Amino acid sequence: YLYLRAVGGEVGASAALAPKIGPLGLSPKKVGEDIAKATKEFKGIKVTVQLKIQNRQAAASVVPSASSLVITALKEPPRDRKKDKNVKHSGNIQLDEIIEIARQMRDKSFGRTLASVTKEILGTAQS
Amino acid sequence: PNVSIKFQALDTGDNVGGALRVPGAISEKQLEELLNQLNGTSDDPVPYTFSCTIQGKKASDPVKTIDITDNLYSSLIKPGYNSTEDQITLLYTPRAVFKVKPVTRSSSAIAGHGSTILCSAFAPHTSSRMVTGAGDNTARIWDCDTQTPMHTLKGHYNWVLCVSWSPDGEVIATGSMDNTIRLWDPKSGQCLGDALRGHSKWITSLSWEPIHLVKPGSKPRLASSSKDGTIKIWDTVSRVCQYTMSGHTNSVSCVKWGGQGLLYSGSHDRTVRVWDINSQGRCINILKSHAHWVNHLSLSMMVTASDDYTMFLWNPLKSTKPIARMTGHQKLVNHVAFSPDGRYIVSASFDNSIKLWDGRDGKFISTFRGHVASVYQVAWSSDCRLLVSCSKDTTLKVWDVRTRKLSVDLPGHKDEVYTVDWSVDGKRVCSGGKDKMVRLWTH
Amino acid sequence: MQLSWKDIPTVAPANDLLDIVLNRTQRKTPTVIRPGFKITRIRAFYMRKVKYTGEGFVEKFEDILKGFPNINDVHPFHRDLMDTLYEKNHYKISLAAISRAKSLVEQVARDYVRLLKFGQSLFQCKQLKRAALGRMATIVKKLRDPLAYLEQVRQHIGRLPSIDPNTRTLLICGYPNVGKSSFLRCITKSDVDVQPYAFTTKSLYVGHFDYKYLRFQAIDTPGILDRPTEEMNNIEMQSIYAIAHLRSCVLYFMDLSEQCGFTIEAQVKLFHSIKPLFANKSVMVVINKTDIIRPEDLDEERAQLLESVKEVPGVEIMTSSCQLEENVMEVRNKACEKLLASRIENK
DSSP B81-122: -SS-SSEEEEEEE------------PPEEE--SSS---EEEE
What is the strand order of the sheet B190-196 is part of? B160-165, B172-176, B181-185, B190-196
Q: How far apart are CA C343 and CA C280, in angstroms?
A: 11
Q: Is B204 on the interface with A (CB under 8 A)?
A: no
- In chain A the first and final C-alpha atoms are separated, in Å, by 29
Backbone angles phi, psi at B311, to 5 degrees: -130, 130
Nearest to C332 by CA among C80, C340, C82: C340
Q: Is A88 on the interface with B (CB under 8 A)?
A: yes
Q: How far apart are CA B349 and CA B378, in angstroms?
A: 10
Residue C175 annotated as binding site = yes
Q: How far apart are CA C242 and CA C180, in angstroms?
A: 20
- The residues near A92 (Cβ < 8 Å, ≥ 6 apart) are none
- The residues near C302 (Cβ < 8 Å, ≥ 6 apart) are none
Q: Is A23 on the interface with C (CB under 8 A)?
A: no
**What is the full DSSP assignment across C305-335?**
HT-SSSS--S---EE-BTTTTBTHHHHHHHH
- Asked whether B255 and B267 are in contact (CB, 8 A), the reply is no
CB contact under 8 A, B241 and A81: no
Considering the domain boundaries, does residue B297 fall inside one? Answer: yes
- Asked whether C221 and C240 are in contact (CB, 8 A), the reply is no
- Asked whether B163 and B175 are in contact (CB, 8 A), the reply is yes
- Asked whether B18 and B35 are in contact (CB, 8 A), the reply is no
Residue C119 annotated as binding site = no
CB contact under 8 A, A13 and C201: no
- In chain B the first and final C-alpha atoms are separated, in Å, by 45
CB atoms within 10 A of CB C26: 12
Q: How far apart are CA B415 and CA B432, in angstroms?
A: 6
- Asked whether C279 and C244 are in contact (CB, 8 A), the reply is no
Q: Is B282 on the interface with A (CB under 8 A)?
A: no
CATH of the domain at B424: 2.130.10.10
Distances (CA, A) of C67 to C74, C98, C113, C160, C201: 13, 14, 30, 16, 30
Residues of A in contact with B244 (CB under 8 A): 88-89
Element containing residue B408 per DSSP (H, E): strand B406-409
- Asked whether B223 and B207 are in contact (CB, 8 A), the reply is yes
CB contact under 8 A, B244 and A87: no
Please report the residues numbered 62 through 81 in chain A whose beta carbons come closer than 8 angstroms to any beta carbon of chain C: none
**Which residue of chain B comes nearest to A77, CA vs CA?**
B244
Most B CBs within 10 Å: which of A71, A74, A90, as the mutation test of the B interface? A90
Considering the domain boundaries, does residue B48 fall inside one? Answer: no
CB contact under 8 A, C261 and A16: yes
Q: What is the largest CA-CA distance in chain C?
A: 100
Q: How far apart are CA A106 and CA A109, in angstroms?
A: 5
Tell me the resolution in Å. 8.7
Nearest to A10 by CA among A60, A66, A52, A76: A60
Distances (CA, A) of C299 to C64, C256, C262, C304: 58, 10, 16, 9
b vs e for B107-119, b when ≥16 Cβ sit within 10 Å of the residue's Cβ?
bbbbebbeebbbb
Backbone angles phi, psi at C270, to 5 degrees: -65, -40
Element containing residue A53 per DSSP (H, E): strand A49-54
Q: How far apart are CA B421 and CA C89, in angstroms?
A: 40
Considering the domain boundaries, does residue B64 fall inside one? Answer: no
Residue C188 annotated as binding site = no
CB contact under 8 A, A82 and B197: no
Q: How far apart are CA C188 and CA B18, in angstroms?
A: 80
Considering the domain boundaries, does residue B210 fall inside one? Answer: yes
- Asked whether B399 and B407 are in contact (CB, 8 A), the reply is yes
Q: How far apart are CA C181 and CA C170, in angstroms?
A: 13
Element containing residue A100 per DSSP (H, E): helix A95-105
Helix H, strand E, coil C: the string for C179-243 is CHHHHHHHHCCCCCEEECCCCCCCCEEEEEEEECCEEEEEEECCCCCCCCCCCCCHHHHHHHHHH
Strands C282-287 and C249-254: parallel
Nearest to B247 by CA among B273, B222, B226, B221: B273
Nearest to C139 by CA among C93, C177, C106: C106
- Asked whether C158 and C3 are in contact (CB, 8 A), the reply is yes
Q: How far apart are CA A24 and CA B319, in angstroms?
A: 46
Backbone angles phi, psi at C28, to 5 degrees: -65, -40
Q: Is B197 on the interface with A (CB under 8 A)?
A: yes
Please give the tally of structural domains in chain B. 1
Considering the domain boundaries, does residue B34 fall inside one? Answer: no
b vs e for C319-342, b when ≥16 Cβ sit within 10 Å of the residue's Cβ?
ebbbbeeebbeebbebbbebbbee
CB contact under 8 A, C258 and A27: yes
Residues of A in contact with C258 (CB under 8 A): 12, 22, 27-29, 32
- Asked whether B224 and B203 are in contact (CB, 8 A), the reply is yes
Chains touching chain C, criterion 3+ CB pairs below 8 Å: A
**What is the full DSSP assignment across B42-93?**
-SSS---EEE--S---SSS----SSS-HHHHHH-SSSS--SS-SSEEEEEEE
Element containing residue B153 per DSSP (H, E): strand B149-153
Q: Is A86 on the interface with B (CB under 8 A)?
A: yes
Chains touching chain A, criterion 3+ CB pairs below 8 Å: B, C
Most A CBs within 10 Å: which of B200, B201, B251, as the mutation test of the A interface? B200
Q: State the nearest Cα–Cα gap between C227 and chain A, in angstroms.
A: 8
Phi-psi bin for B424: left (phi > 0), alpha (psi -120 to 50), beta?
alpha
DSSP B305: E
**Which residue of chain A comes nearest to B247, CA vs CA?**
A44
Chain C residues bordering chain A (beta-carbon distance below 8 Å): 175-178, 201, 222-223, 226-227, 258-263, 266
Considering the domain boundaries, does residue B212 fall inside one? Answer: yes
Q: How far apart are CA A2 and CA A14, in angstroms?
A: 18
- How many residues in total does chain B contain? 443
Considering the domain boundaries, does residue B57 fall inside one? Answer: no
Considering the domain boundaries, does residue B16 fall inside one? Answer: no
Q: Is A11 on the interface with C (CB under 8 A)?
A: yes
- Angle (CA) C134-C136-C137 rounded to 5° is 65
What is the strand order of the sheet B364-368 is part of? B333-337, B344-349, B354-358, B364-368
- Asked whether A88 and A81 are in contact (CB, 8 A), the reply is yes
Element containing residue C300 per DSSP (H, E): helix C295-305
CB atoms within 10 A of CB C230: 7
CB atoms within 10 A of CB B344: 20
- Angle (CA) C336-C342-C347 rounded to 5° is 125
Find the domain containing B258 and state its range.
105-442
User: B212 by DSSP, 3-state: which?
Assistant: coil
Q: How far apart are CA B353 and CA B397, in angstroms?
A: 12
CB contact under 8 A, A87 and B200: yes
Q: Is B241 on the interface with A (CB under 8 A)?
A: yes
Distances (CA, A) of A66 to A1, A43, A81, A102, A106: 22, 17, 18, 9, 11
Q: How far apart are CA A90 and CA A88, in angstroms?
A: 6
- How many residues in total does chain C contain? 347
Sign of the dihedral through C-alpha B20, B24, B25, B28: positive
Q: State the nearest Cα–Cα gap between A26 and chain B, in angstroms.
A: 39
For residue C236, which amino acid is it?
E
Distances (CA, A) of A8 to A32, B247, C259: 12, 18, 21
- The residues near C64 (Cβ < 8 Å, ≥ 6 apart) are C8, C11, C98, C150
Strands B416-422 and B406-409: unpaired
- Asked whether C71 and C90 are in contact (CB, 8 A), the reply is no
CB atoms within 10 A of CB B239: 18
- Angle (CA) C143-C148-C149 rounded to 5° is 100
- In chain C the first and final C-alpha atoms are separated, in Å, by 22
